[PDB]
UniProtKB/Swiss-Prot annotation, chain A:
Residues 15-50, 51-86, 91-126, 127-160 form the EF-hand domain. GO terms for biological process: cardiac muscle contraction; diaphragm contraction; muscle filament sliding; regulation of ATP-dependent activity; regulation of muscle filament sliding speed; response to metal ion; transition between fast and slow fiber; ventricular cardiac muscle tissue morphogenesis. One of its GO terms (cellular component) is cardiac Troponin complex. Ca(2+) 3 binds at residues 140, 142, 144, 146, 151. Cardiac muscle Tn-C can bind 3 calcium ions per molecule. Domain I does not bind calcium. The modification Phosphoserine is found at residue 97. Troponin is the central regulatory protein of striated muscle contraction. Tn consists of three components: Tn-I which is the inhibitor of actomyosin ATPase, Tn-T which contains the binding site for tropomyosin and Tn-C. The binding of calcium to Tn-C abolishes the inhibitory action of Tn on actin filaments. This is Troponin C, slow skeletal and cardiac muscles. It comes from Mus musculus (Mouse). InterPro entries: CALM/Myosin/TropC-like (IPR050230), EF-hand-dom_pair (IPR011992), EF_Hand_1_Ca_BS (IPR018247), EF_hand_dom (IPR002048). Belongs to the troponin C family. SUPFAM superfamilies: EF-hand. Ca(2+) 1 binds at residues 64, 66, 68, 70, 75. CDD domains: EFh.
Curated annotation (Swiss-Prot), chain B:
The gene is Tnni3. Transmembrane segments: none annotated. The record marks 40, 57 as: Involved in TNI-TNT interactions. Residues 1-39 are annotated as: Involved in binding TNC. The modification Phosphothreonine is found at residues 11, 38, 89, 103. Residues 89-110 are annotated as: Involved in binding TNC and actin. Troponin I is the inhibitory subunit of troponin, the thin filament regulatory complex which confers calcium-sensitivity to striated muscle actomyosin ATPase activity. It comes from the Eukaryota. This is Troponin I, cardiac muscle. GO terms for biological process: cardiac muscle contraction; heart development; intracellular calcium ion homeostasis; muscle filament sliding; regulation of cardiac muscle contraction by calcium ion signaling; regulation of muscle contraction; regulation of smooth muscle contraction; regulation of systemic arterial blood pressure by ischemic conditions. Interacts with TRIM63. Binds to actin and tropomyosin. Interacts with STK4/MST1. The lineage of its organism: Eukaryota, Metazoa, Chordata, Craniata, Vertebrata. The modification Phosphoserine is found at residues 2, 4, 110. Phosphorylation by STK4/MST1 alters its binding affinity to TNNC1 (cardiac Tn-C) and TNNT2 (cardiac Tn-T). Phosphorylated at Ser-2 and Ser-4 by PRKCE; phosphorylation increases myocardium contractile dysfunction.
Curated annotation (Swiss-Prot), chain C:
Belongs to the troponin T family. The modification Phosphothreonine is found at residue 5. It comes from the Eukaryota. Troponin T is the tropomyosin-binding subunit of troponin, the thin filament regulatory complex which confers calcium-sensitivity to striated muscle actomyosin ATPase activity. It comes from Mus musculus. The chain holds residues 212 to 285 of 301 of the full protein. Residues 1-13 have a biased composition (Basic and acidic residues). This is Troponin T, cardiac muscle. Phosphorylation at Thr-5 by PRKCA induces significant reduction in myofilament calcium sensitivity and actomyosin ATPase activity.
UniProtKB/Swiss-Prot annotation, chains D, E:
CDD domains: ASKHA_NBD_actin. This is Actin, alpha cardiac muscle 1. Polymerization of globular actin (G-actin) leads to a structural filament (F-actin) in the form of a two-stranded helix. Each actin can bind to 4 others. Actins are highly conserved proteins that are involved in various types of cell motility and are ubiquitously expressed in all eukaryotic cells. In vertebrates 3 main groups of actin isoforms, alpha, beta and gamma have been identified. The alpha actins are found in muscle tissues and are a major constituent of the contractile apparatus. The beta and gamma actins coexist in most cell types as components of the cytoskeleton and as mediators of internal cell motility. InterPro entries: Actin (IPR004000), Actin/actin-like_CS (IPR020902), Actin_CS (IPR004001), ATPase_NBD (IPR043129). The lineage of its organism: Eukaryota, Metazoa, Chordata, Craniata, Vertebrata.
């Protein structure tokens, strides 16, 4: 949400000038000012770096929650810097180990469906039936019916 | 197949785990204080004879010896565990390096720059 | 080789660990004060011993975790 | 606390906590150093893979068992095996657990004394006790009499026991066992064209022996049948393809047990050393020993041995006595189950060799009252 | 500082700084003196054009490769090539950069020793290391096992590796490679009327081979089809016009790889020396080598070779094993990518042959522990 607004607030006019110079081609005229997201596929490729198309679609559909099909210069800026790395250091390796030890409060060294299921239920979050299985795939990477240290580490990799 | 909600759930579970770890640490501290108070009994010795002074002092010295013995034992155990932890951490790091270092490189660093030099 | 080496090591550690023990030959007030001081010393020693117990437990669990991780390579 | 019932054996180390039904971790006892050079850097290559890890990398190792015939010939490797067993397969530090090793009868003293010295100095256990491998197998059957034939992989020994009183003058220990059968099978396979030489391929021949060989009820009739029909030829797929067909090698490999002249050994088979062990006993307990003959150990798992042995003994024994051969389905782990039962007893709790006792009398304490 | 990952090769010198994806400068390794007289004065005519400059003035030069079959036959020209590579294609003085050369297996010692002596005396590098050209190609695939067939332009060698332990007794080096295919193509083109003789026209025949030739899935069917229809005849325009039409010479040139009897060589094709190299390995790692067969080197870029080779090996191998042929799209630079990865490792940073070590033991240091 507006968290990434705060994240992009750090970049001042110094990157805004470059972003406007790049975006000027998008506003090529003969339009009503809607400014869609059509060119964004190559606009994000203006410097060469380009993420997966699925992430690009997620960014496109996520922004402009009003559904106007309009890419605000604020939204364009935050999505273009989103191509650059942006993370809050992802906790700490010892901190992550402590978090997993709390996760493996059963002291089994593995997390099944029930473990993380109860863990998230304690949070009280509404979780769909279409979920859980998605979380099962996210966690049980080896498809061994449990969550191991490596699977947890990649699951929680640099998330903050 | 939602994506942003996955990040939301990740952050929420991270915060919940942090809170649980904090409360568990507080519980550990409280229980440790309770046990320390229970095991180390408080003694009052106002208005006593010097013979009782000698007896209590000798008992305290014996308790000091026993506690130092326990501390020596658990210290040796902890040092050995630390050595094993360091060894296993080194081994797992070596395995991870063997698995991943061949997959890290400088991709497209200068090949794309070769436009019309020739 | 832990038959006389470790025993002598721990015996020396115990011997050097013991400090001066000459008290009861003094006046009552300061002797009581120092007895309370040594009670508090034993209190701190027991607290540290409990902390070491908990640390040893956690490190044992982490050892089990590392053993699981190295076993999972195959 | 709980006791560790380890059982060194020779070929498979079986261990687990006292009071359970089956050993927790069972893995071959082999230590194999790599033999080639190795060119990949940083691959994390160790200097010795022990236990079940060296049965997966056996293609580039030189596996070598540290226990030849009951006795231990390479003490450093045996120490490595024990260290692995304690720390990685059970993950329990030995500083807080009594141990109950097992030893074959009539073994050299120095082996047992070195075993106890290692357990007390290196691993620093609280208390350890060494027991004869046949008494445990008699425990597991729930009997209290009977003559037990414990044909392991290293050595076959035959200890008769009556009413709890072992008869030390009637123990017949024979050194033919599973390993010699593996070598003989590997030697007779060459008659069809299959040559196994490397110490790694001995494991493949062992797998062939386990999965295909069986003991013939009557040897000459089987030799005649296999030479006319082809109903016996069973095929087996090597670890790379090229299936092989075993003909009358199937029942000729385990026949060596009843005719040790095949591998050049002089002594009589396991069918006649049991009868000799019985006849050395007193005249009044022979009926009970006849009726309670017990089989144990891995090598007695061949399909059809409990009938061949009974037929042979019935041929030898007087016609009036009843010959019965106890062959429980849990034969392989019989010794370890008996060890667990013995370690779980309350009456046995004061027989351990406590560490202070060892400090006062040295390693020679094991031969003393604490046997 | 950064390391220089040079890779002499034979036909194309590939070089670049360690840690990138592709070599910085790739250029043919030919040194050609002019052969005519020269009448213009002051034109600035040099005495030897090396590298890619002599592929543009090749009309009046006599190009001659300084590396025949892996080995180096003309040391002065090779020194000239190295000097060009360092100073003009990378523009980094060698006084401040470690170097990582590559060498084919089973090459003469004197070649390697002279190479290290040159690198330490003439160019005066801080430290250099020589690596076998197949281990790098195995690095680049991200594997740790597998048998790699590195069919370069000079020599084709087939090094099997398991779990990082190379098997020195199973290396099968064969001297048929891209150059012999170029000569054979130049020899069979004469059957239509096109005669290429000059050492400059060998480059034109090489271009024809690269752009048109392909490996047939089944040889006899293609020979029958090309002799009836005309759907295969592809034309090509020489550097001056006069287009030529290649008929069944298209798949007959690279067929020499699988039937070296075409150019009179006795040995078996690259489809059967791989199977022989596998069969020399131990019986327990043959499945892994079957499943991880790796292709590398330039000459393995023919369209349709990864299917012909798989069909041939599947014909030879037992029916149960799965045969898989790894053919990454970046085949040509696979060795150099692997070299970059190896030079970028931290564990490898202490294996370089430091100059003080060379000063103490002479050029024969390369055969010692620092391999
Ligand atoms: N199912 C089986 N069929 C035939 N032989 C077997 C079978 N299982 C094990 N063996 C043989 O028994 C040996 C294992 O014997 P074991 O009882 O483990 O010896 P130990 O007394 O040293 O533990 C193996 O080497 C194998 O040759
Ligand atoms: N695209 C291609 N198709 C067919 N053959 C090729 C192709 N590219 C290169 N070759 C052959 O491979 C040779 C280059 O091999 P290379 O891997 O550079 O050898 P080296 O191992 O010496 O570097 C050339 O001589 C050419 O004959
Ligand atoms: Mg046994
Ligand atoms: Mg090459």
């Amino acid at each position: 949400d507006d968290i990434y607004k705060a994240a992009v607030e750090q970049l001042t006019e110094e990157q805004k000038n470059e972003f406007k110079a790049a975006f000027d081609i998008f506003v090529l005229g003969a339009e009503d000012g809607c400014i869609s997201t059509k060119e964004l596929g190559k606009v994000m490729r203006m410097l060469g770096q380009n993420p997966t198309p699925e992430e690009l679609q997620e960014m496109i559909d996520e922004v402009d929650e009003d559904g106007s099909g309009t890419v605000d210069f604020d939204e364009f800026l935050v999505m273009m810097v989103r191509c650059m790395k942006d993370d809050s250091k992802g906790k700490s390796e010892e901190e992550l180990s402590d978090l997993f030890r709390m996760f493996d409060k059963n002291a089994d060294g593995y997390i099944d469906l029930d473990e993380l299921k109860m863990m998230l239920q304690a949070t009280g979050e509404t979780i769909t039936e279409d979920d859980i299985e998605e979380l099962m795939k996210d966690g049980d990477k080896n498809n061994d019916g449990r969550i191991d240290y490596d699977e947890f580490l990649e699951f929680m990799k640099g998330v903050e | 197949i939602s994506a942003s909600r996955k990040l939301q759930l990740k952050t929420l579970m991270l915060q919940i785990a942090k809170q649980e770890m904090e409360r568990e640490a507080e519980e550990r501290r409280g229980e440790k204080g309770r046990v320390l108070r229970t095991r180390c009994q408080p003694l009052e010795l106002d208005g006593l004879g010097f013979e009782e002074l000698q007896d209590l002092c000798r008992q305290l010295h014996a308790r000091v010896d026993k506690v130092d013995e326990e501390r020596y034992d658990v210290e040796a155990k902890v040092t050995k565990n630390i050595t094993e932890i360091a060894d296993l951490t080194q081994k797992i790091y070596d395995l991870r390096g063997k698995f991943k270092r061949p997959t890290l490189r400088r991709v497209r660093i200068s090949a794309d720059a070769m436009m019309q030099a020739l | 080789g832990k038959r006389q080496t470790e025993r002598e090591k721990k015996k020396k550690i115990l011997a050097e660990r013991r400090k001066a023990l000459a008290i009861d030959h003094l006046n009552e007030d300061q002797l009581r004060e120092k007895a309370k001081e040594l009670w508090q010393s034993i209190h701190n020693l027991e607290a540290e011993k409990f902390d070491l117990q908990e640390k040893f437990k956690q490190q044992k669990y982490e050892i089990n975790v590392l053993r699981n991780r190295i076993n999972d390579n195959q | 606390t709980t006791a560790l019932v380890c059982d060194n054996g020779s070929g498979l180390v079986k261990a687990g906590f006292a009071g359970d039904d089956a050993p927790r971790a069972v893995f071959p006892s082999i230590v194999g150093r790599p033999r080639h050079q190795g060119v990949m850097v940083g691959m994390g290559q160790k200097d010795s893979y022990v236990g079940d890890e060296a049965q997966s990398k056996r293609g580039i190792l030189t596996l070598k068992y540290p226990i030849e015939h009951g006795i231990i010939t390479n003490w450093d490797d045996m120490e490595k095996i024990w260290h692995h067993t304690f720390y990685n397969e059970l993950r329990v530090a030995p500083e807080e657990h009594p141990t109950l090793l097992t030893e074959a009868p009539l073994n050299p003293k120095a082996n047992r004394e070195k075993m106890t010295q290692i357990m007390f100095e290196t691993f620093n256990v609280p208390a350890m006790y060494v027991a004869i491998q046949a008494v445990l197998s008699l425990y597991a059957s729930g009997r209290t009499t009977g003559i037990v034939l414990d044909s392991g992989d290293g050595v076959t020994h035959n200890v008769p026991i009556y009413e709890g009183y072992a008869l030390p003058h009637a123990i017949m220990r024979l050194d033919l066992a599973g390993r010699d059968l593996t070598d003989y099978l590997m030697k007779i396979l060459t008659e069809r064209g299959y040559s196994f030489v490397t110490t790694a391929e001995r494991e493949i021949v062992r797998d062939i022996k386990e999965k295909l060989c069986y003991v013939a009820l009557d040897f000459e009739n089987e030799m005649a049948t296999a030479a006319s029909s082809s109903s016996l030829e069973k095929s087996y797929e090597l670890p790379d393809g090229q299936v092989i067909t075993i003909g009358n090698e199937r029942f000729r490999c385990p026949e060596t047990l009843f005719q040790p002249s095949f591998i050049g050994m002089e002594s009589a088979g396991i069918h006649e050393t049991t009868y000799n062990s019985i006849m050395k006993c007193d005249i009044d307990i022979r009926k009970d020993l006849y009726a309670n003959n017990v089989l144990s150990g891995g090598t007695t798992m061949y399909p059809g041995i409990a009938d061949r042995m009974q037929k042979e003994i019935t041929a030898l024994a007087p016609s009036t006595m009843k010959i019965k051969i106890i062959a429980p389905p849990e034969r392989k782990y019989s010794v370890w189950i008996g060890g667990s039962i013995l370690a779980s007893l309350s009456t046995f709790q004061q027989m351990w060799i406590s560490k202070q006792e060892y400090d006062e009398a040295g390693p020679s304490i094991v031969h003393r009252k604490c046997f």
